[PDB]
Write a protein that binds this ligand. Structure first.
Ligand SMILES: CCC(=O)Nc1ccc(S(N)(=O)=O)cc1
Length: 284
């Protein structure tokens, strides 16, 4: 029975290698990765791969791996798929740990914009979780952490991480990670998956997919929000993506809203992640 080697980049930046039967469904690989990670609260996570256009795609756990990666390498990343709006309601510390690791990459990558002070506060909790209590002997006036905190590091930021780290004496790792999450969850771009699009007039917008619905950034700022409950039907056709909105009170008709995506595969990807968010955050 023939097996294909899988390589998975984990959220700590390390590479997990395993073998699955070549006709395996995505769930098979995901189950192996989650067992490796000692992860029980698996519903929030997924694997990604890069298609022939180099676009990130979720690996569908219900479909054959070979029919998704097609002509590409069996190489994946382990990622948060559904960002919980209240991470304190997760049952296990280790789930919150993996969510912290994802958010640290969201921040360094610039997907999750963050004020100077919030960058320093998040960094101070990460340092407290990983090294424990502040030790002066390790850090002098010229200290620069190995930890990546931000898309652009400054000496001022490193200084502010140290100043806040000093305030966290006695804090345990789960405690520090919970504080990390209480701050991160409030950020306006927390768990927002952004897709480039044009409105029905050709004006460049971003569509953000998240727990609280579909966001339209008509400028660079959120100019419209469609909460999932209002959305009855999501669909795509050629390069276009549509949402069917519930009739408002006393309104005769539903309303269908249409957008232009970069190509047909980008419309399909946006449709799939919207359907998946709608389902997940309907049940949560
Ligand atoms: C940051 C982790 C990641 O890769 N997320 C992801 C992956 C794929 C898509 S999709 N299928 O293009 O909508 C959206 C978001």
């Amino acid at each position: 029975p023939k097996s294909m080697q899988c390589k998975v980049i984990l959220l700590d930046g390390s590479e997990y290698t395993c073998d699955v039967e070549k006709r395996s469904r995505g769930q098979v690989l995901f189950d192996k990765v989650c067992e490796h990670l000692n992860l029980l609260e698996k519903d929030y996570f997924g694997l990604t791969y890069r298609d022939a256009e180099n676009q990130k795609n979720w690996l569908d756990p219900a479909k054959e791996i070979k029919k998704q990666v097609r002509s590409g390498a069996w190489h994946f990343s382990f990622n948060v798929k559904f960002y919980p709006p209240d991470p304190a309601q997760l049952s296990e510390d280790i789930t919150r740990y993996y969510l912290c690791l994802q958010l640290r990459d969201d921040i360094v990558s610039g997907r999750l914009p963050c004020s100077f002070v919030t960058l320093a506060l998040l960094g101070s909790y990460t340092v407290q979780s990983e090294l424990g209590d502040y030790d002066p002997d390790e850090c002098g006036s010229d200290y620069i952490s190995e930890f990546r905190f931000a898309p652009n590091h400054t000496k001022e930021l490193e200084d502010k991480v140290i100043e806040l780290h000093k305030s966290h004496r006695g804090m345990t790792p789960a405690e520090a990670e919970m504080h990390f999450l209480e701050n991160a969850k409030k950020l306006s771009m927390y768990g927002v998956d952004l897709h480039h699009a044009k409105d029905s007039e050709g004006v460049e917008i971003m569509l953000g997919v998240c727990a609280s619905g579909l966001l339209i950034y008509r400028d660079r700022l959120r100019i419209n929000r469609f909460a999932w409950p209002k959305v009855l039907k999501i669909s795509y056709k050629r390069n276009n993506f549509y949402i069917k909105i519930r009739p408002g009170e006393f309104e005769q008709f539903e309303s269908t809203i249409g957008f232009k995506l970069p190509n047909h595969r980008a419309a399909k990807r946006l449709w799939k992640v919207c359907v998946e968010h709608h389902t997940f955050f309907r049940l949560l």
